Amino acid sequence: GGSREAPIEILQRNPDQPRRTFREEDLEDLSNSIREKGVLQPILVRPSPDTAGEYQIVAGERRWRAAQRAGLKTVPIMVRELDDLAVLEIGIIENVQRADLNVLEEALSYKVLMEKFERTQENIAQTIGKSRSHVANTMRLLALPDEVQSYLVSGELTAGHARAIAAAADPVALAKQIIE
Amino acid sequence: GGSREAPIEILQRNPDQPRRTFREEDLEDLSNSIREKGVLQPILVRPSPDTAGEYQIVAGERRWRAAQRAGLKTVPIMVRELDDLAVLEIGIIENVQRADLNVLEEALSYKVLMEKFERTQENIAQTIGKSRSHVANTMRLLALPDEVQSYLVSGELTAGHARAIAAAADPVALAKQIIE
Ligand SMILES: Nc1ccn([C@@H]2O[C@H](COP(=O)(O)OP(=O)(O)OP(=O)(O)O)[C@@H](O)[C@H]2O)c(=O)n1
Ligand SMILES: Nc1ccn([C@@H]2O[C@H](COP(=O)(O)OP(=O)(O)OP(=O)(O)O)[C@@H](O)[C@H]2O)c(=O)n1
Ligand SMILES: [Mg+2]
Ligand SMILES: [Mg+2]
Numbered sequence: 001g002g003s004r005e006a007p008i009e010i011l012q013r014n015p016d017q018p019r020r021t022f023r024e025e026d027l028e029d030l031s032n033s034i035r036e037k038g039v040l041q042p043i044l045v046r047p048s049p050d051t052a053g054e055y056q057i058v059a060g061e062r063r064w065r066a067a068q069r070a071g072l073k074t075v076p077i078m079v080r081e082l083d084d085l086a087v088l089e090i091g092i093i094e095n096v097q098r099a100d101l102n103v104l105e106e107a108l109s110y111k112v113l114m115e116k117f118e119r120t121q122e123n124i125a126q127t128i129g130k131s132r133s134h135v136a137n138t139m140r141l142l143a144l145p146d147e148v149q150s151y152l153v154s155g156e157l158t159a160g161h162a163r164a165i166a167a168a169a170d171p172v173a174l175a176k177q178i179i180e
Numbered sequence: 181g182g183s184r185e186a187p188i189e190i191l192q193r194n195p196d197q198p199r200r201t202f203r204e205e206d207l208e209d210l211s212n213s214i215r216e217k218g219v220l221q222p223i224l225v226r227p228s229p230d231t232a233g234e235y236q237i238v239a240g241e242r243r244w245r246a247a248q249r250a251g252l253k254t255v256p257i258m259v260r261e262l263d264d265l266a267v268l269e270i271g272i273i274e275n276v277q278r279a280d281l282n283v284l285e286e287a288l289s290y291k292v293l294m295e296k297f298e299r300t301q302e303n304i305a306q307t308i309g310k311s312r313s314h315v316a317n318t319m320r321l322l323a324l325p326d327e328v329q330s331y332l333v334s335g336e337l338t339a340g341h342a343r344a345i346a347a348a349a350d351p352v353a354l355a356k357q358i359i360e
Contacts, residue, residue, distance in 0.1 A: 003183035003222060003258065018289040019281055026279045033277040040239070040274055041221050042183060042258075059220070062279060078183065078222075085297050089307050092289050094220055095281040097213040097309055099206045099242060101199055101272075109198040109272050117265050127269050129277055153201075158338070 003042040005074040006055070011064055012048060014056050016084070018091040022062065030066035033129025039063050042076040044094070046087060055079065058087045059094040103162050104152055107138045114139075137166040148175040183222040185254040186235070191244055192228060194236050196264070198271045202242065210246035213309025219243050222256040224274070226267060235259060238267045239274040283342045284332055287318045294319075320346040328355045 043060030050056075055077060057064055067075050082090065101109075113119040121139070125132040141152065141162060151157035157165075157178060165174045223240030230236075235257060237244055247255050262270065281289075293299040301319070305312045321332065321342055328345075331337035337345070337358060345354045 002256075016292075018285055020285055021282065023279070030277050033273055037270065037273060040224065040270060044220065076182075088289065088292060088297070090217065090220060092281075092286070093213055093217060093308055096286065097210050098278075099199075099203070100280070101275040102201065105198055105200055106272070106276065109268065112196075112268060113265075117268070128272055160335075 001079055003076055003078045006077045008064070008067060008072055008075045010053060011043070011045060011055050011057055011075065011077070012051065013061050013064070014058070014087060014091075016088070017057070017061055018088065018095065019061065022065070027062060027066055027069070029129045030062055031069040031129075034063070034066050034070040034072065036127055036129060039067055039072070039075055042078050044090065045077050045079055046082040047079060056087075058082060058090050102153065103138065103159055104141060104149060107141050110135055110139050111142060134163075137163055140166045140171060144172055144175065148172070151175075151178075181259060183256055183258045186257045188244070188247055188252055188255050190233060191223070191225060191235050191237055191255065191257070192231065193241050193244070194238070194267060194271075196268065197237070197241055198268065198275065199241065202245070207242060207246055207249070209309050210242055211249040211309075214243070214246050214250040214252065216307055216309060219247055219252070219255055222258050224270065225257050225259055226262040227259060236267075238262060238270050280339075282333065283318065283321060283339050284329060287322050290315055290319050291322060314343070317343045317346040320351065324352060325355075328352065331355075331358070 041060070041063070043063050044058040045055035046058055048054035048056045058080075064075065110121075110124055113124050114121075119127075121132050121135045124130075124135045128135075141149070144152075144165075148157065152159070152162055161178065165171050165178070168174050221240070221243070223243050224238040225235035226238055228234035228236045238260075244255065290301075290304055293304050294301075299307075301312050301315045304310075304315045308315075321329070324345075328337065332339070332342055341354075341358070345351050348354055
């Protein structure tokens with residue numbers, strides 16, 4: 001059994017899904033991102049244990065909720081027979097076994113969009129489903145010295161602190177201030 | 181066009197993929213995780229622009245490399261016609277449009293594996309493809325006071341710092357020390 005488009009309305013959440021909390025800010029970004037390029041990773045479901053002809057989401061609740069807000073009529077699914085232990089395992093694995101992109105690898109990606117493909121920071125924001133603010137701030141990090149970038153490449157400079165350092169009117173000045 | 185199993189050997193990487201660096205530590209965890217439950221999210225590819233009957237990975241290089249080390253003969257793929265702008269966009273989106281699990285939501289998930297399903301910390305480690313160390317340290321956080329957990333629930337307490345705080349013989353003592 002491969003992956004198929006299926007009517008969004010015949011899908012339901014597992015209450016015992018490892019993820020409890022869902023921030024509006026993030027869900028808005030995903031629904032925006034889905035409105036543009038659609039649902040890119042198919043949603044993992046098992047046949048519903050409670051209701052007939054329904055599917056219980058094993059992995060991809062945010063995708064389902066985002067696609068709902070985005071007003072998509074169908075979603076891509078993969079149906080696999082799974083017991084309650086399998087689902088909890090998979091639920092953890094999909095979210096735990098994945099490496100985040102370095103904020104500089106992200107910034108460089110935006111540079112290439114601008115230079116090689118002549119995309120404005122607005123064009124980028126609209127396509128990737130993030131704010132013009134986030135894009136601008138992310139790219140400003142490319143200005144910083146090689147040494148401070150090496151701190152972000154290494155992780156020494158906190159990834160959270162990076163977005164803050166970027167927002168500053170005098171961003172490079174906050175490099176030495178990071179020590180204290 | 182859905183998703184199909186395809187021989188791992190007819191897949192190649194895009195050199196211009198947003199992600200440049202690949203840490204051995206993480207790739208080992210993924211290959212372990214894949215050795216157990218296989219490749220859970222199908223790998224997004226376009227028909228190779230250079231070589232005939234080959235596919236260029238748009239999203240899922242780590243999965244491909246992990247599955248390779250894991251000695252998988254086939255991998256699940258989805259083939260879509262995509263130009264160089266599409267691929268760079270999608271490459272960014274799949275990695276940028278996704279929310280990480282709270283370290284406490286992770287710990288609780290492991291608790292339920294132990295209590296509801298009678299899994300040892302070794303059983304968990306083997307199935308999720310992480311270290312017994314990582315599992316033990318992650319669960320120890322559930323012991324900590326509601327106040328310091330609120331710091332991790334909020335994010336104030338660095339998620340990386342959490343596993344370290346947990347390992348400490350006197351973990352709660354690091355709460356006031358989080359001033360610096
Ligand atoms: N047994 C597993 C473990 C993990 N994953 C998935 O593999 C992906 C790993 O994400 P990432 O670190 O970004 O690597 P890839 O997407 O494989 O590669 P890249 O982003 O570099 O293209 C995640 O979707 C995760 O759910 C999976 O399909 N099967
Ligand atoms: N246009 C987009 C944007 C993002 N994604 C994918 O949506 C997932 C978001 O991951 P996460 O934040 O964990 O949410 P879900 O996996 O959807 O939900 P859950 O983990 O709660 O099951 C990622 O694999 C990302 O590649 C996608 O398919 N299409
Ligand atoms: Mg997920
Ligand atoms: Mg990825």
